[PDB]
Amino acid sequence: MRFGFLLNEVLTGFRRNVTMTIAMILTTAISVGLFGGGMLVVRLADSSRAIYLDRVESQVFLTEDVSANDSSCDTTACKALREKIETRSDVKAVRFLNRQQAYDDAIRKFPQFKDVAGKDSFPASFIVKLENPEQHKDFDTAMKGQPGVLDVLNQKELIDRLFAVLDGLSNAAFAVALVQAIGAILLIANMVQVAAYTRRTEIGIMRLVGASRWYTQLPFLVEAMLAATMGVGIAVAGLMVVRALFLENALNQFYQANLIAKVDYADILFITPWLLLLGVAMSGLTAYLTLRLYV
């Protein structure tokens, strides 16, 4: 029935003991915050995959006169340079990117390329993929900075070290979020145990009056739900608190330094309904499984 006569006893229930009832909120906030840290570094990897290049990638440049002109590859020289690149078997996903379709994706990956970009913005590139990271050293030897094919770039072999840092810290964040989730699920598991221990006077009365079996555990469930909302209400604020605490040394300076793609509060805020729904779901299920085998 109406929740007005059900809300008036739960506040008294938090009022009787205060030295135990406040501890759970910060622990669930820490668990949710580290899990959201893992989510935000996964989304950071997803955003940084767009600006950077993946682990099957080794691009190549072309000769200056060939790259500075010859937009249509119907001529002899563009096909000759393309076949010179395609002599080896490493060519898999070369793209027809030259000049007019090469300005927009290249002004966003680096900020100082947009400076004085009116004259000689970007020549022909023809970015190509790779299947063998251990066997393209001779390919880079043939396609080195010798006159002809210009200098190349390889986003691996002590170059993708930031990716190897971030996925490892993402997995470490996943592991510590798992052990915080285990601690959280056991502490809100024995929440109802110590609550029924501290409120054992009326339990036999509720078994005596003959009320419905669904309605007996409803105050404990609404205390679990309001405790979950109290946890997530400071969990969504502690991320901003630690950002404004210890992100001002960098903030957006990695955008000009081209380390990360983007950072903004809305990217973290995109994950909040999923984490609060999973939090109230885990709170409800451990309420139900603990009440099933105790009374």
């Binding site: 100082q112 390329f113 000689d120 970007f122 020549p123 300076q253 330094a257 380390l259």
Partner: protein, 126 residues
Amino acid sequence: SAQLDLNEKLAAQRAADQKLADNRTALDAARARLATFQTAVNKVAAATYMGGRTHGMDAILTAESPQLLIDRLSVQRVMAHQMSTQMARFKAAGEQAVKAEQAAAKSAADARSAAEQAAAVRANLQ
């Protein structure tokens, strides 16, 4: 009288003609200076191309020795200072194509005005 009112201004007319003539041989210095400067600012986007990868913050994506990466940042921050001052050095030459180049045209118009004035006054003799 009116014949005698000539030689007091041939000196000023020759001075005006020589002031036009040497400034015609002095206006070429600004266009020669921009003809020296503009080649270093036209394909600098191609100079930072070929995977430049150095920008003055990290200098850490390649490493062989700790001593050899010190000048990868200690010189690159001075490069950041120089590309900050490069726009000022470019505009200090670009202002010469905006300021103090219409003075030759103004002097030519003033010389033509003096020529028609001298043609107007000389009707007392002729």
